[PDB]
Amino acid sequence: GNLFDAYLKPYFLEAYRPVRKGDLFLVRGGMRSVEFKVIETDPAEYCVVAPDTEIFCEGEPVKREDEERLDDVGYDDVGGVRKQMAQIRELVELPLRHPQLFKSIGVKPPKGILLYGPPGSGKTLIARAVANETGA
Amino acid sequence: KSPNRLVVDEAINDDNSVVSLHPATMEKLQLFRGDTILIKGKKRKDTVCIALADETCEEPKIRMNKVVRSNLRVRLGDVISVHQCPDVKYGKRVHILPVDDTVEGVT
Ligand SMILES: Nc1ncnc2c1ncn2[C@@H]1O[C@H](COP(=O)(O)OP(=O)(O)NP(=O)(O)O)[C@@H](O)[C@H]1O
Numbered sequence: 382g383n384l385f386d387a388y389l390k391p392y393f394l395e396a397y398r399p400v401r402k403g404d405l406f407l408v409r410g411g412m413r414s415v416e417f418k419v420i421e422t423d424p425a426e427y428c429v430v431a432p433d434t435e436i437f438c439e440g441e442p443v444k445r446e447d448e449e450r451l452d453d454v455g456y457d458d459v460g461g462v463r464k465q466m467a468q469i470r471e472l473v474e475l476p477l478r479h480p481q482l483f484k485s486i487g488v489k490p491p492k493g494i495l496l497y498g499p500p501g502s503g504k505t506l507i508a509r510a511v512a513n514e515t516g517a
Numbered sequence: 518k519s520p521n522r523l524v525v526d527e528a529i530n531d532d533n534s535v536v537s538l539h540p541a542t543m544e545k546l547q548l549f550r551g552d553t554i555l556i557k558g559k560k561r562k563d564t565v566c567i568a569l570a571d572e573t574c575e576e577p578k579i580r581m582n583k584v585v586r587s588n589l590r591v592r593l594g595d596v597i598s599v600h601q602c603p604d605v606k607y608g609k610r611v612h613i614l615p616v617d618d619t620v621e622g623v624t
């Protein structure tokens with residue numbers, strides 16, 4: 382339908398927002414999140430949207446072209462766990478992102494992690510969030 | 518049976534040059550404390566180390582760390598021969614390199 386007034390107009394009406402060609406931005410509403418890719422911008426690839434600026438959204442859907450799902454589980458999709466998530470990050474992100482440094486240092490970090498808790502408290506969600514945030 | 522043949526054992530100090538001998542054995546061999554001596558083990562390996570007094574050790578035994586034992590290719594319970602070598606001379610230059618496996622990474 383009229384996606385423009387439904388999603389974009391509230392998203393740009395109030396604040397002057399920067400935009401760069403090829404970037405995808407997420408708009409939440411209607412019990413769903415919609416990813417909009419900036420096909421073209423003027424006068425250059427970098428621009429700032431203003432009330433007088435024209436917005437054209439009459440084209441067909443665009444493919445993902447190897448882009449990652451912006452709705453994938455992340456640290457922002459997990460709530461009620463800040464201390465535990467901090468411990469998990471400190472254990473995991475440092476070696477996985479920087480394995481060369483750890484193998485050069487010679488110190489052995491822990492590898493066995495056990496998330497225990499009542500059903501429905503996360504666990505599966507936390508692991509997916511960590512994996513998606515580390516790309517491992 | 519010789520006064521210079523001794524059974525290696527575990528050491529106290531972890532330095533790679535200090536070797537502790539029972540003062541009785543050193544006096545028997547007429548060895549000056551804190552001087553240089555030469556130790557021969559198995560095969561044909563030998564090392565040069567500074568000796569020291571330690572009454573805890575026994576006369577028929579000498580205490581060395583794993584480094585010196587590895588250099589001598591001798592395990593615990595083996596026998597080594599000790600010879601006084603106070604004539605050791607200071608070296609003008611030494612070319613030393615690390616090992617690949619141990620130095621992997623750090624550069
Ligand atoms: N702490 C949380 N924060 C946000 N959403 C959560 C949280 N815990 C659970 N959820 C939501 O509830 C869903 C079901 O819980 P989930 O964590 O997937 O089950 P689980 O803990 O793996 N169950 P079990 O393995 O049987 O103990 C999740 O996929 C999220 O959508």
Ligand SMILES: [Mg+2]
Nearest residue numbers: 503504505506
């Ligand atoms: Mg589960």
